[PDB]
Design a protein around this ligand. Structure first.
Ligand SMILES: *[C@@H]1O[C@H](CO)[C@@H](O)[C@H](O)[C@H]1NC(C)=O
Ligand SMILES: *[C@@H]1O[C@H](CO)[C@@H](O)[C@H](O)[C@H]1NC(C)=O
Lengths: 50, 56
């Protein structure tokens, strides 16, 4: 069943006991923290095989 | 505890796993802050059951 990704993330917040408005009022910060964290995986996997 | 939904002209709130539309009210919903902070907000009446009881 389709759902907008920001609304899906608001229900994944609501599922950990953090209220939905904490996503929608911080959505650009949360998106930038996720995009930044995926960049650290890419750099770490490129940096070492260990 | 639900999602906002529109049939094409009206706005309703439903439980997520089964379609059961309700009128939007100050009990089905909660407030946080002004309109300007939220990406993709929409404009609608939210009904208040106390107002007719004070008018009567
Ligand atoms: C939407 O809901 C209202 C209220 O039940 C109804 O009058 C209307 O015909 C429905 N359909 C559309 C497409 O607006
Ligand atoms: C929502 O309502 C306010 C007040 O009438 C208006 O300033 C604003 O432009 C409206 N926004 C949309 C998306 O229609």
């Amino acid at each position: 069943l389709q759902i907008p990704f920001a609304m899906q993330m608001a229900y994944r917040f609501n599922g950990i006991g953090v209220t939905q408005n904490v996503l929608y009022e911080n959505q650009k910060l949360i998106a930038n923290q996720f995009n930044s964290a995926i960049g650290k995986i890419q750099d770490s996997l490129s940096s070492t095989a260990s | 505890e639900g999602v906002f939904v529109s049939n094409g002209t009206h706005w309703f709130v439903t439980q997520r796993n089964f379609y059961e539309p309700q009128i939007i009210t100050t009990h089905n919903t909660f407030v946080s802050g002004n309109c300007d902070v939220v990406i993709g907000i929409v404009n609608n009446t939210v009904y208040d059951p106390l107002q007719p009881e004070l008018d009567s």
